[PDB]
Design a protein around this motif. Structure first.
Motif, PDB file in Angstrom:
ATOM      1  N   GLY A 122       0.799  -1.208   0.000  1.00 59.59           N
ATOM      2  CA  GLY A 122       0.000   0.000   0.000  1.00 59.59           C
ATOM      3  C   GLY A 122       0.843   1.276   0.000  1.00 59.59           C
ATOM      4  O   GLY A 122       1.973   1.275   0.492  1.00 59.59           O
ATOM      5  N   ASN A 123       0.233   2.357  -0.523  1.00 54.19           N
ATOM      6  CA  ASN A 123       0.795   3.704  -0.587  1.00 54.19           C
ATOM      7  C   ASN A 123      -0.200   4.781  -0.172  1.00 54.19           C
ATOM      8  O   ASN A 123      -1.413   4.653  -0.329  1.00 54.19           O
ATOM      9  CB  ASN A 123       1.122   4.160  -2.003  1.00 54.19           C
ATOM     10  CG  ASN A 123       2.447   3.610  -2.461  1.00 54.19           C
ATOM     11  OD1 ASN A 123       3.486   4.088  -2.042  1.00 54.19           O
ATOM     12  ND2 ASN A 123       2.421   2.547  -3.242  1.00 54.19           N
ATOM     13  N   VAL A 124       0.378   5.859   0.338  1.00 58.69           N
ATOM     14  CA  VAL A 124      -0.296   7.097   0.665  1.00 58.69           C
ATOM     15  C   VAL A 124       0.670   8.185   0.210  1.00 58.69           C
ATOM     16  O   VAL A 124       1.799   8.241   0.701  1.00 58.69           O
ATOM     17  CB  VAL A 124      -0.585   7.187   2.180  1.00 58.69           C
ATOM     18  CG1 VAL A 124      -1.187   8.534   2.552  1.00 58.69           C
ATOM     19  CG2 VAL A 124      -1.434   6.027   2.696  1.00 58.69           C
ATOM     20  N   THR A 125       0.256   8.979  -0.790  1.00 57.16           N
ATOM     21  CA  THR A 125       1.017  10.128  -1.267  1.00 57.16           C
ATOM     22  C   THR A 125       0.410  11.407  -0.692  1.00 57.16           C
ATOM     23  O   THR A 125      -0.581  11.371   0.042  1.00 57.16           O
ATOM     24  CB  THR A 125       1.182  10.157  -2.799  1.00 57.16           C
ATOM     25  OG1 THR A 125      -0.069   9.903  -3.432  1.00 57.16           O
ATOM     26  CG2 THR A 125       2.178   9.148  -3.327  1.00 57.16           C
ATOM     27  N   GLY A 126       1.014  12.549  -1.034  1.00 54.34           N
ATOM     28  CA  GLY A 126       0.630  13.825  -0.460  1.00 54.34           C
ATOM     29  C   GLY A 126       1.682  14.900  -0.721  1.00 54.34           C
ATOM     30  O   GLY A 126       2.876  14.683  -0.506  1.00 54.34           O
ATOM     31  N   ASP A 127       1.210  16.063  -1.198  1.00 54.64           N
ATOM     32  CA  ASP A 127       2.013  17.274  -1.283  1.00 54.64           C
ATOM     33  C   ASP A 127       1.506  18.298  -0.262  1.00 54.64           C
ATOM     34  O   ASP A 127       0.568  18.031   0.493  1.00 54.64           O
ATOM     35  CB  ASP A 127       2.165  17.792  -2.723  1.00 54.64           C
ATOM     36  CG  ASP A 127       0.900  17.787  -3.569  1.00 54.64           C
ATOM     37  OD1 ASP A 127      -0.116  18.340  -3.117  1.00 54.64           O
ATOM     38  OD2 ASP A 127       0.945  17.241  -4.688  1.00 54.64           O
ATOM     39  N   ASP A 128       2.168  19.464  -0.233  1.00 52.71           N
ATOM     40  CA  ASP A 128       1.802  20.577   0.634  1.00 52.71           C
ATOM     41  C   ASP A 128       0.503  21.210   0.137  1.00 52.71           C
ATOM     42  O   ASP A 128      -0.212  21.836   0.919  1.00 52.71           O
ATOM     43  CB  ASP A 128       2.939  21.599   0.782  1.00 52.71           C
ATOM     44  CG  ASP A 128       3.623  22.029  -0.513  1.00 52.71           C
ATOM     45  OD1 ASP A 128       3.160  21.631  -1.610  1.00 52.71           O
ATOM     46  OD2 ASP A 128       4.627  22.762  -0.414  1.00 52.71           O
ATOM     47  N   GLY A 130      -2.076  19.932  -0.218  1.00 51.04           N
ATOM     48  CA  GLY A 130      -3.173  19.254   0.469  1.00 51.04           C
ATOM     49  C   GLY A 130      -3.771  18.056  -0.281  1.00 51.04           C
ATOM     50  O   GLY A 130      -4.712  17.441   0.209  1.00 51.04           O
ATOM     51  N   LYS A 131      -3.204  17.719  -1.455  1.00 51.15           N
ATOM     52  CA  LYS A 131      -3.623  16.620  -2.328  1.00 51.15           C
ATOM     53  C   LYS A 131      -3.080  15.260  -1.834  1.00 51.15           C
ATOM     54  O   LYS A 131      -1.880  15.063  -1.653  1.00 51.15           O
ATOM     55  CB  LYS A 131      -3.266  16.968  -3.780  1.00 51.15           C
ATOM     56  CG  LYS A 131      -3.315  15.812  -4.767  1.00 51.15           C
ATOM     57  CD  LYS A 131      -2.540  16.097  -6.034  1.00 51.15           C
ATOM     58  CE  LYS A 131      -2.721  15.035  -7.103  1.00 51.15           C
ATOM     59  NZ  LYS A 131      -4.143  14.829  -7.476  1.00 51.15           N
ATOM     60  N   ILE A 132      -3.997  14.304  -1.631  1.00 54.45           N
ATOM     61  CA  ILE A 132      -3.733  12.974  -1.102  1.00 54.45           C
ATOM     62  C   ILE A 132      -3.866  11.985  -2.261  1.00 54.45           C
ATOM     63  O   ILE A 132      -4.753  12.146  -3.100  1.00 54.45           O
ATOM     64  CB  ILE A 132      -4.724  12.666   0.057  1.00 54.45           C
ATOM     65  CG1 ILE A 132      -4.628  13.677   1.209  1.00 54.45           C
ATOM     66  CG2 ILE A 132      -4.615  11.217   0.539  1.00 54.45           C
ATOM     67  CD1 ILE A 132      -3.395  13.539   2.104  1.00 54.45           C
ATOM     68  N   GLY A 133      -2.980  10.974  -2.311  1.00 56.86           N
ATOM     69  CA  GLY A 133      -3.031   9.892  -3.289  1.00 56.86           C
ATOM     70  C   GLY A 133      -2.838   8.520  -2.633  1.00 56.86           C
ATOM     71  O   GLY A 133      -2.432   8.435  -1.478  1.00 56.86           O
ATOM     72  N   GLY A 134      -3.112   7.448  -3.381  1.00 57.17           N
ATOM     73  CA  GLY A 134      -3.141   6.114  -2.812  1.00 57.17           C
ATOM     74  C   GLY A 134      -2.917   5.020  -3.852  1.00 57.17           C
ATOM     75  O   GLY A 134      -3.274   5.212  -5.011  1.00 57.17           O
ATOM     76  N   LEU A 135      -2.373   3.875  -3.392  1.00 57.49           N
ATOM     77  CA  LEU A 135      -2.036   2.706  -4.201  1.00 57.49           C
ATOM     78  C   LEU A 135      -2.269   1.418  -3.391  1.00 57.49           C
ATOM     79  O   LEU A 135      -1.789   1.281  -2.265  1.00 57.49           O
ATOM     80  CB  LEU A 135      -0.571   2.866  -4.638  1.00 57.49           C
ATOM     81  CG  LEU A 135       0.032   1.877  -5.647  1.00 57.49           C
ATOM     82  CD1 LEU A 135      -0.246   0.415  -5.328  1.00 57.49           C
ATOM     83  CD2 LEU A 135      -0.309   2.206  -7.089  1.00 57.49           C
TER      84      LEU A 135
END
Lengths: 293, 293, 293, 293, 293, 293
Positions: A122-128, A130-135
């Motif tokens: 699993g993954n959890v991404t994110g920039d400043d 405020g955008k969240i991503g996932g795998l």
């Protein structure tokens, strides 16, 4: 063995309560570079139905790794021993027979290994920003490995009769400066057969482009030392108590050649180009228990 | 062996019911740094067709890893032993013969391993922006591994005759502070042959840039201890019952040189620059069963 | 060995049909922390051309891992044994000779392993936006591994003569709490030589920052127990049948120092700072078959 | 060994043609939980220059893994054996000497392994939008692995004299439910020393939070069984033919403590808190060949 | 074994205080390429309830790997030995019985290995555009490996009675130039059975497309050397003291065929196409203790 | 051993020139499922200071893996042996003493392995839009692996005195259908202790949800066969020459329970719920050299 069948070890063996007569016959064959030694033993055990002679064929057949041709500085050849052989033969009409011989062909083996892996991740991404991503991910993996031992030369018992037996010790394959193994049939489309090639594109003369003998199986230069045993049995009642036997030692040489293309070195191997046979007749005297040559 | 062919262990061997006469002969050759020892045994077994002498050549040939030249602080040389040899030879006209010798050349081996892997893998992606993604993948993988033992020195039986036998113990390759192995022919375009180079660009004088002997094969300094056996057979009927034999011990030294370029250290190795030969004649008395030097 | 050359096991050995006289001499050297033991055996086998004495040098040389200096709480030093040695010498003019010795220097080896992998792989991508993507890939991988054993100390036979022999058991390298190995020349630009450094930046006094001896080779504290054999041969005919021999046991100590920089601990090692030599003369009486000290 | 120096196996040994007198002395020390056994053997071999006594110290020192304090349900302690010791000593004035002892300290080793991998890889991407992409990549990888054996306790010979010898069997390190190894100095900033901690934050009383003894080295509870040999030599001519000898068996215990912080369990270890010493004097009678206590 | 049940080793074995009569009978069967050797031993131990005969069936059954058909240059066939067999049988009405035999069927084993890995990983990204990114990830991996040895041929004891016993040595599987293993039933949709196929699409004639015999189990050409033991027991009280026994040696050959499609080579294997049986009757004389053929 | 201290092998042992009296006493305890066998030997060697009795405690304690409760189809329990024990005790006032015992507790070990890998890698990207991209990367990896053997049961010597000795063979851990190992304290938040749980959520009755005994250590059902040795020494001078000794064999059973939650099976284990003790008194007669029960 004896103990597996409830029998005191060595009860079924031949040769207690018997004087055994032994001897050495050594012949050096200068022409063929073969030191030949027969070590024999007569065992006349009265509790055994026949007389026995054990003939141990030893000595050393020189390799004779000879760099031969030199036709320019582009072409060179190497005669090398791909096979060594020892054979014994009793003439057609003799009463003595071949009763046993060692060693024999043993069953080869290999280790087989299978592997299976399942994987989750699993993954959890994110920039400043405020955008969240996932795998979410999976994987399977099926594997197999085969593992076996490869001697440089193989030692083989040639199918005996009651009149003949022999061994051949044949080139199998070999490592060349950590590459390979290569064998008599190796074939790379560009480099040909690299078996004894020192470099792919060094700029020495051809004759200097063979693998250093010290970096090859030492059976290829210094040579092979047979250590084979043959047992001959003979009837006590036979009329003729003299037997002849022939022993041949044999070197088979292949022909490895290097030539320069325009760009690189290419090797060729030709099988069985030269054979050296050293043949000797020995006289077996069963009454006096002597072998002579 | 005896038991493979249904024969009580040790029935065919020589030397029961026999007094055996033995002896030690020790000679130190100060000039060549060789302690030479012969341990011999005469075995006159009346059930054997010939008299036997077993000659064991022992002692120790010093390495003599000498840092020699010092022509400035940029150039230095190291003499080092790339080969040790022991040879025995019966003169041309003698009736005694070399019958056997130990050890001999054995068949080298290697482990070969092949692997095959198939793989499937999958994804589901996704951000907060409600966007969904996906991945399906495969892979194949074919592998091979080769594994073999590489001794620092190889011990090799030189092709015997009935009149001569010898061994050479030759430098094979070696690890230098966990790098390598390097050998006599190693060649890196920048550093040359790094066999005995302590550092690539340390700022000591050249003579201080050789690998510490304690970190190298101890055969290179303290030296090699031969342990070889030769069997000589002799006819009981021969007229002359006195035999001469020569034993040579030999050190072959290479020449490893370091020089500073402008930027780094570079090494060269020149093969077989010096040979030290220590020769001794021994007298074999078959009637009294004594060897003398 | 005997059987390889067709000879009944133990036929060529010395010392059947002979009473053997043996003895122990034990000397403790309090000043040098060495328990020295000679165990000897006279073997007068009348079938051997010479008298023999086997001298076994045993006992134990204490390590003497002493934390010595304490000049502040920033500076400390450790004396530690980098070498232990045992040597025997027969005076210049004696007729007795050193004939053999065990152990000797063995040829070291190493396992070499190469790997080759080829790989193909594929993808199909896709989002909710109906967009399809694709990937085709390949890879090669070439590998090598080198594997060898590294003892904490090496045991080396010093080049013998006919009058002297010795061994040195020298520090090779060592693991320090799972780091290393480190050796006498290890050098990290920040930490110096970390050989016996317990911590990189703990705040104990320097004298408390050495590796716990229990976590190091026990040769470093409790010490080394020699177990060496020397054979001396003597002529039955010699005029003088009394021989002297000298045996030295030796400890060589290095000097490992710790100092605080501004930020961390740094170690130094200086080679061969102290040598302890304990010498004893022994009298060999060949007629009575006694050694005395 | 004998055969390495051409000598019939067992020729140089003591104790043929000799009656050997042996005995057992058993003493149980209830206060200290030590079963002490001496098995001795007098060997008066007239071909040896001195009389010998072999003393084997055996029996079993109980571990005595006691969970002791219980001062609340937040605080608990465990006494555990970090060292076992057996020592023998001949008084100042005695003519007898310690001549040998087994076992001794052997040189430890480690396997070192280096790996080098080179890799090339390629890609081709592509969507339905006709867009092509590509990747070319390389990688190098240098690796080293170190592999060695770590016994739970080490058995060490303490530097002998001619009057004293001893062994200590000291705690080295240990696995705790598959974590670790931990040792006497392990320190995690949060959990302290986890050596015998069953759980990081279970909610049992402190006294129930120690590793189950069955899951630890069995030397820690059931205890250690010494098996050490000492050889004492004595002059036949000595005036006094009676010798005293003292044997200590020793248990050293550390103090492992658990306390609850606010959040988790933390462990402490204090070295050498309690020592149990059991001393016995034995009388050696060389004329009668008896030991008594 | 004896010692596991508190009994002096070799107490329960047959054949001390007994003269044993042995013999060799050798028969070569030219038509079937079988060298057949019986080595027998009669043991009449008066402390045993019955007479015993141990019959050891040895010799060598030639492989007879014959490339036979050549019907064009597109079609070729290979006869190859998939089984070798030795069987003994006492006629219906005999009072002698088969009492034991060696070897027997062993329990095969395999190593099983499971793996579990958890992984955590983290990222911080960033460009010059001042933009920061992050990644947190996990993975699980559950694995299993199965590892076992696979001999080229298996040696199997066929279910004995009191009147018959036999072994079959059957082809199991084999590596073909590092591919496989292949066996009698291998089936690839395109290449068929690749067991003895040298190349997938070389352009030689069919007869030149078989694996080099030197690269295959040497049992396939040079052949198999049986080494089997049978014990026959006989009552002292029996009226008839002569027994007949039949021994069959057997070669089973499969038929491996190659044909060219339009594009590549395809192989077929047909089981058990040819059988060679060589049968011999032997006469056992219990009173004289002789076997004759 | 003898040879380490220059002493002919077996010189220091007890029991030459002595008739040894031995015997068997077998008692089956039906109620407790214990076959108890004592095999004893009196050894009165006049060169030893005391009489000896060796007592070998053998036989077999049945496992008695009994699925007991059945209170519904949701609840079931399994009694299983977590410990087996054998103990010997001489009464308080006896003069005989326990002198020795085998086996004893041996030091456990483990292999430790550390790895360090450095990596460098590069990229070149590119689309059809002519745009080039690039990547340079590094990585470090520090690793450790710990490898040790974990028997299903441990065999432990309980701290002896001079009056008592015993062993316990205790359950350590075990694999359940390739999961685990599990032990007496395993605890999964959902499944509880899965030690003997066949399935996580199968729908059989509870009593059918235990691991098949054939898939578990065979000590758990068929049981454990002690093989322990105790040596008792006795003074020749003692007034009372009759000694009593008690031998207890012991089975400790845990209680593994399964219950259904609403969703899955959950297991519990309770330590030491049942103990079976089988006690026997034996009479040792030192004058007649007999033991009786």
């Amino acid at each position: 063995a004896d103990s597996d069948i409830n029998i005191k070890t060595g009860t079924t063996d031949i040769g207690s309560n018997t004087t055994v007569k032994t001897g050495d016959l050594v012949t050096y064959d200068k022409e063929n570079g073969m030191a030949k030694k027969v070590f024999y033993s007569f065992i006349d055990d009265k509790n055994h139905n026949k007389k026995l002679l054990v003939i141990r064929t030893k000595g050393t057949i020189a390799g004779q790794y000879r760099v031969y041709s030199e036709e320019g500085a582009n072409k060179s050849g190497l005669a090398w021993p791909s096979a060594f052989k020892v054979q014994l033969q009793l003439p057609d009409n003799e009463v003595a027979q071949i009763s046993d011989y060692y060693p024999r062909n043993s069953i080869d083996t290999k280790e087989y290994m299978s592997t299976l892996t399942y994987g989750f991740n699993g993954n959890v991404t994110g920039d400043d920003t405020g955008k969240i991503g996932g795998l979410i991910g999976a994987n399977v993996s099926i594997g197999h490995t085969l593992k076996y031992v490869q001697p440089d030369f193989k030692t083989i018992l040639e199918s005996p009769t009651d009149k003949k037996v022999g061994w051949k010790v044949i080139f199998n394959n070999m490592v060349n400066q950590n590459w390979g193994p290569y064998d008599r049939d190796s074939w790379n489309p560009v480099y040909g057969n690299q078996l004894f090639m020192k470099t792919r594109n060094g700029s020495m003369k051809a004759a200097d482009n063979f693998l250093d003998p010290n970096k090859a199986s030492s059976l290829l230069s210094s040579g092979f030392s047979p250590d084979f045993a043959t047992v001959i049995t003979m009837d006590r009642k036979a009329s003729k108590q003299q037997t002849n036997i022939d022993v041949i030692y044999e070197r088979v040489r292949d022909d490895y050649q290097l030539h320069w293309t325009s760009t690189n070195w290419k090797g060729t191997n030709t099988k069985d180009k030269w054979t050296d046979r050293s043949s000797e007749r020995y006289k077996i005297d069963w009454e006096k228990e002597e072998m002579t040559n």
